Amino acid sequence: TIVPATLPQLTP
Amino acid sequence: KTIVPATLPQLTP
Amino acid sequence: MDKNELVQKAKLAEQAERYDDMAACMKSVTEQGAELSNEERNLLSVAYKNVVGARRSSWRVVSSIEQKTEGAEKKQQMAREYREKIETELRDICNDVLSLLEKFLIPNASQAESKVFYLKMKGDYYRYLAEVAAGDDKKGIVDQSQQAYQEAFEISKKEMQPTHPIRLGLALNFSVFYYEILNSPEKACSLAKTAFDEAIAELDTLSEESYKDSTLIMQLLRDNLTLWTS
Amino acid sequence: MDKNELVQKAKLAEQAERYDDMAACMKSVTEQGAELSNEERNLLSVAYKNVVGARRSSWRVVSSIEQKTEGAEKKQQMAREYREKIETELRDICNDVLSLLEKFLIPNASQAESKVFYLKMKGDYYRYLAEVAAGDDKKGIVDQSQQAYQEAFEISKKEMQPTHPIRLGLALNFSVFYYEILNSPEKACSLAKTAFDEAIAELDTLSEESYKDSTLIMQLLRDNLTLWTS
Ligand SMILES: O=C(C1=C(O)C(=O)N(c2ccc(O)c(C(=O)O)c2)[C@@H]1c1ccc([N+](=O)[O-])cc1)c1ccc(Cl)cc1
Ligand SMILES: O=C(C1=C(O)C(=O)N(c2ccc(O)c(C(=O)O)c2)[C@@H]1c1ccc([N+](=O)[O-])cc1)c1ccc(Cl)cc1
Ligand SMILES: [Mg+2]
């Protein structure tokens, strides 16, 4: 269930 | 801050 | 209060990870009516991404749990009801952003770059709604997302270079929308690959102020393609 | 069958990192007037720890940003005001927990182990209050923390085994209170060492059910001593 990258990205 | 003194309960990482 | 104080405050909230506050400050700034500066635009975007982001994660977790407890029943209804509550928070958040977008942000955008940014943003927030939409309302939301994206896409090809971060970011998200929202991996891969290839073809249009973001994004496109072409 | 549901919902909330929900659920459980189980009280503990722990992290960040602002009095000022906003939330959270303890938890604690747990907790929440206490009120708040921790200590020395996790955890936090609040590193160190040594002396008192936790907390005590000793 790996979700591909989108921008902006969530803060670590 | 460096290494902080531990207290319980601890926050979920 | 003063717009300048609200921006400093937003910056403060960000550092303190109080995203609800950040978003409040930035929404207020936007509500003053003057066109946002590049910095204010990105702070707004940051605040809302994190705020809506919290709920998106929560929804995923609970959805996950609700599907795994299938057969348990009493718990399932617990999860269903909670998931629903989270969904409502989410829509409210999304409805706030979209309203900002239609009444203040997209109308006041006087340069192609910000117009594209905001239209992408519109595509993103409708995308988030599509994810938790009632079956009856879903199609309408998906078209509304696609439309916003489309429009931004057109403007970008015409007014911006292929290496522009915002053009690249749009392509990244638009393609994800095809993969994840329309279940059309062909168009998602096509869109991404093309965009990456065009950025690669005009590598000489990289700017001093933005070559780092361009290549990071190029690489994000690659990550998605690889992920999808395996 | 609401109480079971609330506990189910609290766990769901915890998994979804929605701590405000979790604590609200647990507060309702408490307010029903029946003595909490070990699971219930620990859920409550964690929920409120996360809720208050966010404001503490935030307070730290802003305080430090506010103090590293050598100039820019308008920035600094704004930081101060924001800090005060955060402090108020924290006091409210603290006061909520304290009130539960005073009204429901401590009064209905029928075994020493529960009594110690809740008294420790009272000491902790008063300690948090002391960290953001206004000069004129600080002494009383500090005293209330110390009094609570002291009562629990006394009870634990008398009714419980030196390897009991709750007894060990109390020593851990009480020692930290001395170090951090009363600025007494020597007492902080003395209390911690005494507790570790006593546990070690009665290592045969470890139980099937608690031996992981006892040892884990003993390591924590050592961690603090090593950081303070060096
Ligand atoms: O954090 C980031 C960024 C900033 O802090 C910032 O200032 N960016 C940026 C750059 C070039 C620009 O022309 C403008 C502008 O005028 O709006 C903004 C970055 C940015 C890039 C894309 C989007 N997007 O909408 O897809 C948003 C933001 C960032 C985060 C992840 C990655 Cl892999 C790269 C950068
Ligand atoms: O997660 C933990 C724990 C639990 O999940 C749990 O149930 N604990 C526990 C055990 C024995 C007990 O007698 C009672 C009881 O009387 O309620 C509780 C643990 C516990 C231990 C100490 C405290 N403290 O505040 O001092 C709190 C909680 C845990 C977390 C970190 C560490 Cl390094 C060890 C354990
Ligand atoms: Mg536990």
Residue window 1-12, chain A: list those with CB within 8 Å of chain C: 1-2, 4-11
How far, CA to CA in Å, does C195 sit from each of C179, C204, C206, D34, D211? 15, 15, 15, 63, 58
CB neighbours (10 Å) of residue C203?
13
Could C53 and A10 be called an inter-chain contact, meaning their C-beta atoms sit closer than 8 Å?
yes
Minimal C-alpha gap between D61 and chain C (Å): 6
Q: Which residue has the tokens 């009130």?
A: D99
CA distance C144 to C122: 9
CB neighbours (10 Å) of residue C7?
19
Interacting residues of B11 by C-beta distance below 8 A, sequence separation 6+: D49, D50, D53
Interacting residues of C62 by C-beta distance below 8 A, sequence separation 6+: C79, C82, C83, C86, D12, D15, D16
Of the candidates D15, D79, D82, the beta carbon closest to that of C61 is on: D15
Measured from the alpha carbon of residue C216, the closest ligand is: 1
Which one is the CATH code of D2-229: 3.40.50.1860, 2.60.450.10, 1.10.150.130, 1.20.190.20?
1.20.190.20
What are the pocket residues of ligand 1 if the criterion is a CB atom closer than 6 Å to any ligand atom? A 7-9; C 38, 41-42, 113, 117, 165-166, 169, 210, 213, 216-217, 220
Interacting residues of D12 by C-beta distance below 8 A, sequence separation 6+: C62, C65, C78, C79, C82
**Is B13 near chain D, with CB under 8 Å?**
no
Q: Which residues of D touch B8 (CB under 8 A)?
A: 169, 172-173, 217, 220
Scored b (16 or more CB within 10 A) or e, C38-66 reads eebbebbbbbbbbbbbbbbebbbbbbebb
CA distance D121 to D149: 8
Phi, psi at C220, each rounded to 5°: -70, -40
**Is D9 near chain C, with CB under 8 Å?**
yes
Q: According to the entry, how was the structure determined?
A: X-ray
| Nearest alpha-carbon partner for C13 in D79, D114, D156, D190 | D79
Domain C3-229 has CATH 3.40.50.300: no
Both tokens assigned to D20:
């405000």
Resolution of the experimental structure, in angstroms: 2.0
CA C32 centroid distance within chain = 23
Could C124 and A10 be called an inter-chain contact, meaning their C-beta atoms sit closer than 8 Å?
no
The answer to whether C40 and C29 have CB atoms below 8 angstroms apart is: yes
DSSP-derived 3-state class of residue C33: coil
Instruction: Give the CA radius of gyration of chain D.
Output: 19
CA distance C25 to C125: 19
CA-based torsion, C176, C180, C185, C186: positive or negative: negative
What are the domain boundaries of chain D? 2-229
